[PDB]
């Protein structure tokens, strides 16, 4: 968290440079992150699965 070039995500296993939403622009990382089946409720909660 708060690492890499773009300030967002940064894997230390091979130095994949992600953005804040985890999108690769430097490294051999093939794909980007997957949105889970989550839905917010405005009581500052979220159902995740």
């Amino acid at each position: 968290a708060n690492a890499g070039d773009f300030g967002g995500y940064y894997c230390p296993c091979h130095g994949s440079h992600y953005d804040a939403s985890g999108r690769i622009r430097k490294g051999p990382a093939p794909l980007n992150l997957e949105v889970p089946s989550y839905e917010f409720t405005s009581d500052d909660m979220v159902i995740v699965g």
Binding site: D44, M45, V46, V48
Partner: protein, 49 residues
């Protein structure tokens, strides 16, 4: 007989019945400060909020 043997032994190495039980969690949001990540257990893997 041989392909049924292969099917039953692959099914024995396939999975376990209790592993297929996985949950739908409820997560609270704003206990995490502005600019911080935190993981929650889903399937053992980290769950980035």
């Amino acid at each position: 007989a041989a392909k049924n043997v292969v099917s039953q032994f692959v099914s024995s190495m396939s999975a376990s019945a209790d592993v297929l039980a996985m949950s739908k969690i409820e997560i609270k949001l704003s206990d995490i400060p502005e600019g911080k990540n935190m993981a929650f257990k889903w399937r053992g893997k980290p769950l980035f909020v």
